[PDB]
């Protein structure tokens, strides 16, 4: 089988900036008819991927003019002569000139745009499911740049450990962004246990730790 | 109006069968192939074969033949693709793909069907809202959301508003608690202004217990 090896595994461009990503293929790729079927897709995590590139250079209906394709016998290169928010996501490359069809691994394209720092919102668990037994603690960092954040629960001024989870966001295709909830988990006789909640939030964009609070069942 | 939608997200035991599907609209079923690709973390993209829609005539990828079954109904426009003793390495999503323009490229995709192969017990989904408070505002700004916890397995799909809300939403990817259930949160953030006009309704779909959840955030007077 014809195995498709991209390089570089991943990339971080500035917005403005050209990208290259090459692609390798483990033997030549031209099919009966003479042609080489060689295409490049662009995949968002969650969606399906999207088609940009055919036949190593021929661009599709609808996909910008910063796109181009180039290459002969193995070696073929996509290229974004200036980068935008759109084009994050994982390009892959494609040979379809000998059965089975194969695939790249991927090469993941990061936008290396300006620091924003993070808003930040505290949400107390709701009453629902305090009757239920448990307390979820919710805080949210929203659209900010880069993604290295950190996140420390204070419970009555006692730094926690071992109660909470986060995630984080893909990179946003309009604004370039990361967004961040952690979430702290007691049970309701944990939760009872103490009085004030607070999520305190370091950031590159903060000049001093931003720290959002409330009080137990006080509303 | 070229579309390609499949079956939803599936959860069957090891040794099972599931057999996913694709309805095909906006062109002549029997113009073009139907292909499937599968997508699972590590092995990535594969094109698994395609089917000729005019005789069912098909060809496997060699590592899919006997695990893969593919077939078409012209007459609803359908595609299947049938996976036969489920083992926990297919749990993948599955994409069905055609090309419209003889075999130049693969221009229209299925949105992906995700099937998971476990033995462990399906769960819906508990909703709670996060509701916008004093605590949920930044200048002008409220966040509000719903918080999805203890469901398995994966996924659950969040739309706001029956799907008219998308500006600001951030569904957050899923975490795995150490209990092997899984939970996630769908924020976004609107004017604090309009607190009192709008509505947020939040919409949980879990395909794999059949659950579908509406839970309307409240603001909160704190
Ligand atoms: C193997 N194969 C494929 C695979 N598709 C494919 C798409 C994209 C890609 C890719 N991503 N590069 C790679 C492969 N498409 C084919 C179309 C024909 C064909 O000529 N016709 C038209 C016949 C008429 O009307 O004269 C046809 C149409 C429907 C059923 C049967 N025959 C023959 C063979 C074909």
């Known amino acids: 089988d014809i195995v498709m090896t991209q390089t570089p595994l991943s990339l971080s461009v500035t917005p403005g900036q050209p990208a290259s990503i090459s692609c390798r293929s483990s033997?030549?790729?031209?099919?009966?008819?003479?042609?080489?079927?060689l295409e490049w897709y662009l995949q968002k995590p969650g969606q399906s991927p999207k088609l940009l590139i055919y036949?190593?250079?021929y661009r599709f209906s609808g996909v910008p003019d910063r796109f181009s394709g180039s290459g002969s016998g193995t070696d073929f290169t996509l290229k974004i002569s200036r980068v935008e928010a759109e084009d994050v996501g994982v390009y892959y490359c494609?040979?379809?000139?000998?059965?089975?069809?194969?695939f790249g691994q991927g090469t993941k394209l990061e936008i290396k745009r300006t620091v924003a720092a993070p808003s930040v919102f505290i949400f107390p668990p709701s009453d629902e499911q305090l009757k239920s037994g448990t307390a979820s603690v919710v805080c949210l960092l929203n659209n900010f740049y880069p993604r290295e954040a950190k996140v420390q629960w204070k419970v009555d001024n006692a730094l926690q450990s071992g109660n909470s989870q986060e995630s984080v966001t893909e990179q946003d295709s309009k604004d370039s962004t990361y967004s961040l909830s952690s979430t702290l988990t007691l049970s309701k006789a944990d939760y009872e246990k103490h009085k004030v909640y607070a999520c305190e939030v370091t950031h590159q964009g903060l000049s001093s730790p931003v720290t959002k609070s409330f009080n137990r069942g006080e509303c | 109006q070229v579309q390609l939608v499949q079956s939803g997200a599936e959860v069957k035991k090891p040794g099972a069968s599931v057999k996913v599907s694709c309805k095909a609209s906006?062109?002549?079923?029997?113009?073009?192939?139907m292909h499937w690709v599968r997508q699972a973390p590590g092995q990535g993209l594969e094109w698994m074969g395609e089917?000729?829609?005019?005789?069912?005539?098909?060809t496997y990828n060699e590592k899919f033949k006997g695990k893969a079954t593919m077939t078409r109904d012209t007459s609803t426009s359908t595609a299947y693709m049938e996976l036969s003793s489920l083992r926990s390495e297919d749990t993948a999503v599955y994409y069905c793909?055609?090309?419209?323009?003889?075999?130049?490229?693969?221009?229209?995709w299925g949105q992906g069907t995700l099937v998971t192969v476990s033995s462990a017990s399906t769960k819906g989904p508990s909703v709670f809202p996060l509701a916008p408070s004093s605590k949920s505002t930044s200048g002008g700004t409220a966040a509000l959301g719903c918080l999805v916890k203890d469901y398995f397995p994966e996924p659950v799909t969040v739309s706001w508003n029956s799907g008219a809300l998308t500006s600001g939403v951030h569904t957050f990817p899923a975490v795995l608690q150490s209990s092997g259930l899984y939970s996630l949160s769908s924020v976004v953030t609107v004017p604090s202004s309009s607190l009192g006009t709008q509505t947020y309704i939040c919409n949980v779909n879990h395909k794999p217990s059949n659950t579908k959840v509406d839970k309307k955030v409240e603001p909160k007077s704190c």
């Open positions: 793909t055609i090309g419209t323009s003889g075999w130049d490229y693969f221009d229209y």
């Open positions: 494609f040979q379809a000139s000998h059965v089975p069809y194969t």
């Open positions: 089917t000729n829609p005019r005789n069912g005539g098909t």
């Open positions: 033997q030549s790729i031209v099919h009966s008819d003479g042609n080489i079927y």
């Open positions: 036949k190593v250079s």
């Open positions: 906006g062109y002549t079923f029997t113009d073009y192939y």
